Write a protein that binds this ligand. Structure first.
Ligand SMILES: Nc1ncnc2c1ncn2[C@@H]1O[C@H](COP(=O)(O)NP(=O)(O)O)[C@@H](O)[C@H]1O
Ligand SMILES: [Ca+2]
Length: 419
């Protein structure tokens, strides 16, 4: 079977990853057929971290692009499409400096056009794209778009689809199929996939990614407490104020100050709860910050930093997280650890360790008070980062859309048998 290939660079706020996908030439339109062939993690920061030195943005991709030449067979280089899609890191930079944004985009374009792949552009995704393409990825890999049954006996209602929650470094997305009336066009999505219509809700909360939330909690802690109740007792660091306050997410809230943790789970909870404005809703129902959201429903996969954080809680802390009440207890126990106690659980490298308490607490509030999961809906949420040997994220769904590999309708409308 002759294989075709495709490459997406996911240029996220904190890192770039390259994914290489392969599929058989003559089965390319079947759902669930495309899979991941390989991947590469670019060393250092995301492309937006090179705003003041844009040529390094392109250079940073070279090691992974060299790997792609070895991963994809040589006779196939020229007809392999390559895409770069950039997310909230580049969206935040476009707020600060559209000129610096264009120069970063020009530097990666210039590097990518030097390679023999069919280079199809470097683009910034909208938040909607980001959310919807992650939802397409998860459901395509799990074959949720197959029409189940057979003639004279189709399953009814049709197979449910998996909602997607993506916790990135600078934004977070929530996307799910819904039968609720749409009250905000900015959230409303209609897809036509394999002959079927899917009514989907999506929203992207810019500045509610993990790294921007950790910055906002640091600015907040500095302002209200002059200690960090989410960091563990005995941990301290020298905080550079210009770094804290340069983000568009924190400029809302001495060059160096010392800041220490206090392991105070209750003050940590109070600090995180200030992130969610629930006072005002111009719609019949909101998530938070005045944003329209219909009731969460169906199964969900929570990936990226949702997965990594819960995996810390289950695997390193040894704590169960099957209910919202367990996840909340796991958070308190984590936040109550001292720095020596936390460090004694992690024999190897400790980067991110002081932050798990804050992120876990944000995730618990995001789900229960942001999105209004309760014990009943939360039971339908799985934390996973892979499906069918393929990393879950927006890259695959992006590549599928741009390469036109999901047909709106089946061939001949399958003789109309699905009508
Ligand atoms: N091992 C880990 N433990 C906890 N968090 C981890 C992790 N590995 C990556 N992450 C976090 O996932 C997030 C991935 O986000 P990105 O794709 O870089 N940000 P965006 O442009 O999608 O908004 C980062 O915050 C990263 O630090
Ligand atoms: Ca991301």
């Amino acid at each position: 079977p002759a294989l075709k290939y495709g490459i997406v660079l996911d240029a996220g706020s904190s890192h770039t990853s390259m994914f290489v996908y392969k599929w058989p030439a003559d089965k390319e339109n079947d759902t669930g057929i495309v899979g991941q062939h390989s991947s590469c993690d670019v060393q250092g920061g995301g492309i937006s971290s090179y705003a003041n030195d844009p040529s390094k943005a392109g250079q940073s991709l070279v090691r992974c692009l060299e790997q792609a030449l070895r991963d994809v067979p040589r006779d196939r280089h020229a007809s392999t499409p390559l895409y770069l899609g950039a997310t909230a890191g580049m969206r935040l930079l476009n707020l600060t400096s559209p000129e610096a944004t264009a120069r970063v985009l020009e530097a990666v374009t210039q590097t990518l056009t030097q390679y023999p792949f069919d280079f199809r552009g470097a683009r910034i995704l909208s938040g909607q794209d980001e959310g919807v393409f992650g939802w397409v990825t998860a459901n395509y890999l799990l074959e949720n778009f197959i029409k189940y049954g057979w003639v004279g006996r189709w399953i009814r209602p049709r197979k449910g689809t998996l909602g997607a929650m993506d916790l990135g470094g600078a934004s977070t997305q929530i996307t799910f199929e819904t039968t609720s009336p749409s009250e905000d066009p900015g959230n409303e999505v209609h897809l036509r996939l394999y002959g079927q219509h899917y009514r989907v809700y999506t929203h992207s909360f810019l500045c509610y990614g993990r790294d921007q939330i950790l910055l906002r909690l640091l600015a907040s802690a500095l302002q209200i407490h002059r200690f960090h109740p989410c960091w563990p007792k005995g941990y301290s660091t020298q905080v550079l104020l210009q770094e804290v306050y340069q983000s568009p997410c924190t400029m809302g809230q001495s060059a160096i100050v010392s800041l220490s943790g206090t392991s105070n789970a209750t003050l940590c909870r109070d600090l995180v709860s200030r992130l969610f404005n629930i006072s005002s809703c111009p719609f019949s129902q909101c998530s938070f910050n005045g944003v329209f959201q219909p009731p969460v429903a169906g199964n969900f996969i929570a990936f990226s930093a949702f997965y990594y954080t819960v995996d810390f809680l289950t695997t390193v802390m040894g704590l169960p997280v099957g209910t919202l009440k367990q996840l909340e207890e796991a958070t308190e126990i984590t936040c109550n650890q001292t720095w020596t106690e936390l460090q004694a659980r992690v024999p190897g490298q400790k980067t991110r360790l002081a932050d798990y308490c804050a992120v876990a607490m944000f995730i618990h509030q995001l789900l229960s008070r942001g999105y209004h999961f309760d014990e009943r809906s939360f039971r339908e949420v799985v934390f996973q980062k892979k499906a069918a040997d393929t990393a879950v994220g927006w890259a695959l769904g992006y590549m599928l859309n741009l390469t036109n590999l999901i047909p709106a309708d089946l061939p001949g409308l399958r003789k109309g048998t699905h009508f």
